[model samples]
Target: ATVQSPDGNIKIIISDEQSTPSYSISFKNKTVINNSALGFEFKQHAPFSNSFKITKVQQQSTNTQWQQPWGERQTVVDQHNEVTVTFAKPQPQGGTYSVRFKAFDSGVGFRYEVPKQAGLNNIEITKELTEFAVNNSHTATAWWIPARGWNRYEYVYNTTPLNDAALVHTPFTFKNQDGVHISIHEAALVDYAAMVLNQRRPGVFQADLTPWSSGVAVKKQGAFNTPWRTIQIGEKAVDLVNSDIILNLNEPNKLGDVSWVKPGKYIGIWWGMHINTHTWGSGDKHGATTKNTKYYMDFAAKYGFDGVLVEGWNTGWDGDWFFNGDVFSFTQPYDDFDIAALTKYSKQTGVQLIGHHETSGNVSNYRKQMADAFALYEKSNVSQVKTGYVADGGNIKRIDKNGIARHEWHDGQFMVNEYLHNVKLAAKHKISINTHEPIKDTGLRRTYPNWITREGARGQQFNAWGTPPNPPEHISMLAFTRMLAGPMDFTPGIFDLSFNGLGANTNRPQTTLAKQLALYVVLYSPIQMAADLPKNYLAKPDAFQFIQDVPTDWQQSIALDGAVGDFIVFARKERKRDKYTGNDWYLGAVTDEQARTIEISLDFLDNGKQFEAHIYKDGKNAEWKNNPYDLTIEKRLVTASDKLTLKLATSGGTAIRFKALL
Candidate 1:
């Protein structure tokens, strides 16, 4: 496949495979023009301003070719002065072909779209597309263009019939050639764009051997949105294998797989609920307070908890009263709590403190004191920080307080970029960050390895706000969407599960004790926190067996079965690096609202070696909706030929551990 260039300034290359194409499309004027003095910018508020205008757009392509289908001539869109530039489809000098596009003034399009603030100069747009055609599935191939500097980029549908549609900026979707699809595992905030990155011409073609293509078979969900865990023949799995993240400078500061962050599943204690009792207040507090929280911490150390997350530790609050939430203090407590003693005692007790910071969306406040704050944290040897943000300001940029530019988001690129920034800052102090009220995610663990986990979905917080809420199909929906992005910290497991005992959560009626147990495996997180008081867990040590047996890192992973809003089954393995003897496999499954049965195959286990199966399932006559506290754990022996049938009650599920018969 080949095509001769008309203007001849650029050369185009197409491939025989959806591998990727090459092009010589360079800007005639690499110099950026800012007309802010002329005052021509988008009519957006503080955080989303565009102060520049692109007057002329020019591009030329020469030799071009294609693989599945060929295209030749270069399609052009010469819309000047307008905010967006729609790149017309390529006119094949060989065959019929088209490319879709829409471009915005880099300034007003992303999270950093403040026309009032411009420092860096170089701007380049790189779109990479790959072909994934599953048999009998209508698909479109799309890629998330890591847009940082410039604004949003749109995909034009065709040449003559110009359907310039702005893809939903974040958590976008795209289709492929097969029935397969790709989407964000969770919503995003500052992400840039999603598009195919290659340039293909009509009469000429250039071949490159990478999974980058211009045109992908489109699906109804655009081309990149993928439904979770549908195992069929020839489904092109993007990046295979499990639990290993790619760590490098481009990914900034990441500590590899980070299985060392949290060892065996351990019982933990935390500032239970946001009950402003403060230990100095007059009201009765049901959850753990600073006074009892210290007691719980010591108790947790005595029992077993890898770490504890304590929120509301600082001086920021909703009201001024302690009862009415008005009074506050920033200094360390001198009452029943002694910071120096607690830190020393924690070290001796083998319990680590996961510090807390509620920024209230005031980046300026936190930014000014981050250096000192991290310094204070270092004295305690803090390993993680759980920060909270609850503001929706118009001028929010995901940067630190010292005025260092960190992330770029055009349209919907915020979620991923912010998560990256959070991890990077935390990594500086060897701290893992657990964020609340944050953006969504798409598994980029390969990039920021120590990003341990995140909370993109609505968590049990609903139970706190007096909302009788049990997220239906919540686990099932995440497997395809949220889980795909990275590890999710849903904070499951509460032994004393009834919500009625708590003052604020009286309206929400929590899940059964056993259902909380099932959630430990249902929700995937590297730093899995036993988010319950130590007293509750200590009440029954037998329950800790499952947590102790679970491993943080995995050898491999597979979404065995299920759909987006229905039921799902996940299997994970532990190939303890160089140690092969301790290898084990874990599988978890749950249904939406109906009871379903699934058979598990232990083929992923060591072949030819018999194995013992420790299983936990919904008990007979027990339902997660009512009798969840009465569930039981059963153990048995199983092998490759054996099938572990799963009987999931309404809104209930099962989990298993496969230890080789060594």
Candidate 2:
């Protein structure tokens, strides 16, 4: 049987040949996914191998509307067509399983499920054979990273030909020369092992799951439903950004009355540690002392930042913190870090103190203290917490007293539950969470708004320590791949592009100074971090003005133009309103290692209104490596019909503020 999208531009076909189920997708009559197979393997029993008969087929459609408590947009429309195929396989343990597929105008999602069966009591999944077979004849390229079971998702994106793909993480994004964009990822990942895609050959890929310490993929009791494995389809590359298919696949709001989850910008004591200006331990220059936190609070108050994140405030970071495994006290502050006094100071300054809990990959202990930690923060009215796992490198492993692996694989079922538990526990205390070293976002924020943001990709810290720090193209690619999943705490603002300031000359930010300013508007996150120190911003107050003015939540966003991993332009209207017109808009544009010119039409602006544009761009002599700090700020009066041209320096960017004239 076959299904067509509401717009009739996309088509899907499902076929079972000799009891083996396969499917394909076509866009505008051009093949996108060739015939691909789907099934699963078991450890003790023979895999759900053959003789699958279609017992029934059901189709349905729905359209609904929902509003976000806090997000890029206020409301989103959930509309799609769903088809369920019930199949009976003559297994050693006889039973039937079903596959459900949902088709949206933008893309499609499907998952396998086992209903209540008499003979099948418990089952273990050794492997899942879900595949995405692209047409080799079409010229295609992808931005991807090797599949990592541990080290919890930290890799720079590689822009490569589809044929060159080996093992990759999702949501892996690809584009055909013909302009069709496809992203493969899973949604509502609960008890199942996280799925990674590995290339079987040129244009062919299959699902690979993180394993348990015992080498099992997933163990389930009773009826089971796998997470929705999704394939988001789009015509223009930006369509991936515009498509809400991943969010639509997830369950709706589960937490009631989430008014406490406020989204805004913040400054933190983190970047100084990254740049070697301050240490994380209990040294004279420790970044999280009572006085240092007071300094950051003063800065946050002087500026308009809503919160201040203080790492190294908690008890830990003294000895082999990562491997020794029991170095953190979730509720205890360091001797020099007076949490109570800082809390009082933050309240006086009208700035909230964002909490930090860095688990050295010791989930076992973190879980024990999770609730108490939230309780401690609540006493101070701190409603947001940044949690991290810097242990076991990236795999997030935990061992027993005997040194046996106690945690399941990173991004596996056990870790998923552990992460979700933290969110739910935080919700219980009315606190929001920003997780670093976390599971890949699968749109759960729609269900739990308090699960605000996470650092699931290589973010700004790379510029401080990476061997060859992230190149300028990294953010451009991430805007399509990782950002598509959900909000990211990329820690964008860094005024000091050169590492020369802190006596650290070996590493520096790879983008021109203006590009750093542009990240505030380009990267979409509710809780953005002004990562550089207060002194850095004070040194360049003119550029810092944009960071202070840019809004975190948007009423609307437009991806104007660009290529994957090349250059891109974004326009966003702050989530504020005017009686006669819409809210103010901000524009951010960035280029890779090569320079480019972007011509933008102000059609997205409020029509029939005049507006002033504050433009920040790279200076004439600006180059990422040579003279990255060179920048210029210009102003212009523009209308809806006006057009503006911007020249970007190599590894450079531009940021603009559009205010409607009353």
The per-prediction tally of clashing pairs is 93, 5
lDDT of 2: 0.84
| lDDT, candidate 1, 127-206, per-residue tens | 11222121111123332322221212211111110012122222322333433333322212123332222213311111
Model 2, residue 115: C-alpha shift (Å)? 0.8
Summing lDDT over every window of 10 consecutive residues in candidate 2, give the lowest-scoring window.
498-507
- The models' CA-based lDDT, in order, is 0.43, 0.84
Candidate 2 residue lDDT tens string, 1-662? 67777887788887777446788999999989998887888887566756777778888887987887778777788778888888776646556888888888888999998888775568788988888998862378888877763444678788788888788889999988787889999899988889988888677888888877778888898689999999989888788888778788889899989989988889998998887788877887788898888888889998988899988887778754566347578888888988889778877998989999888788877877887899999998799999987754335656666867665555877788889999999999999999998889998998989999999888999888887678768888888888888889999988887665322244677888899988888888998999998998999999999988888888778888877898888998888631213468899998988889888899989889888999999999887777788899988999989998979998899999998788
Candidate 2, clashing residue pairs?
150-394, 150-395, 151-394, 151-395, 152-394
- TM per candidate: 0.62, 0.96
Residue 56, candidate 2: Cα error in Å is: 1.8
RMSD to the true structure for each prediction, in A, is 14.3, 2.4
